[PDB]
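Agenda item 2: adenosine-5'-diphosphate complex prediction
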Amino acid sequence: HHMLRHNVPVRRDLDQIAADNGFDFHIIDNEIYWDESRAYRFTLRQIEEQIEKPTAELHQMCLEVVDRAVKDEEILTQLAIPPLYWDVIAESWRARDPSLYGRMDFAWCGNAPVKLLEYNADTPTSLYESAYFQWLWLEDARRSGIIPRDADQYNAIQERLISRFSELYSREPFYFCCCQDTDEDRSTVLYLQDCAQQAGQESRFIYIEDLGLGVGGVLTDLDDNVIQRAFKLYPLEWMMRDDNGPLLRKRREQWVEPLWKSILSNKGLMPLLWRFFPGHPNLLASWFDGEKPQIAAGESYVRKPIYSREGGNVTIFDGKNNVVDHADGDYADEPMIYQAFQPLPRFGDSYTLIGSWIVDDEACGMGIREDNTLITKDTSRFVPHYIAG
Ligand SMILES: Nc1ncnc2c1ncn2[C@@H]1O[C@H](COP(=O)(O)OP(=O)(O)O)[C@@H](O)[C@H]1O
Ligand SMILES: [Mg+2]
Ligand SMILES: [Mg+2]
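Presented output:
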């Protein structure tokens, strides 16, 4: 009973639905992004046994990596974390600064275990699509009969987000920030803000570019109010490269995601998982650039940056060391890791990637991306899925 994809009719009023629900990036410069012309059908057993339980287990494995890495300067060095920040990252972990969310990327292997490619443990997007828009799609699809009436979906993300913001409630305003000139980032953060407000959390939005510093480096908003806690859709590694990075050592602001997530939002995680859990069914052999390769001669392999996103500067090599595929990106100068190669599955002419969501520590949903090559990148489309049987 294999997982499959099938065509489905696009809703005749899709553009109106997107507009009415704040989905202002379902089309991106006149290219389809949200793609409901097809859908993936999983069984409940595939969800529970191959996606949900392994995601939860992998997150526990990642927390063990954090606990070991904060104690080991050689590991922190391999992770390319600047030594200025080792103490504050270690303290962030020791205080167990609260986490909100993270998203793993998986290569689907049919009846075999999924393979973990990376852990977007800091600033994952495709959240609005995964938590909200595809659930509305499911409700419409069940009633129009294009999928079974009793179809489900692997998706409790919104409920877990709201409940997590409830656990983190403070009388102090919770700031939300992202950079300018990206509707996707703004709407991802707006969605999180909406979830926080549904839990009773007073929330304020400010652009990263509008953040100010008062005397002595106190973080302030545009009205010179002191910012005590903020969610930032902005990479931890960029915060630590910023000229104002050293201010993080004072721990005067609460950040979500917290500083200890810098160990996980880091492709150096993949060699560390392979080191500490060799042979785990969901892991691929992986090593830092310069270490002895952990594949045999002839096998294909992947090189990718430690810090990157959206497929930037991924190279797939064959076992004669020729380039199989390569993606442009702004990360050409970052240090690199290697990983054994597991091609994404191909459906029609698209290559399919599973993003599996964690909220705090709970596996609670998934969203699918399709793209035209083996390397998921900036042209990828989001595709709904459902559960049947
Ligand atoms: N070990 C691998 N085997 C096969 N494909 C890979 C591997 N690692 C990455 N890829 C491809 O490259 C894409 C991007 O890699 P990923 O680790 O998700 O980094 P990011 O999305 O942060 O650039 C993946 O979605 C997949 O298409
Ligand atoms: Mg990815
Ligand atoms: Mg990524």
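Discussion summary: The chain has two domains: 25-266+347-387, 269-345.
Owner for follow-up: CH.
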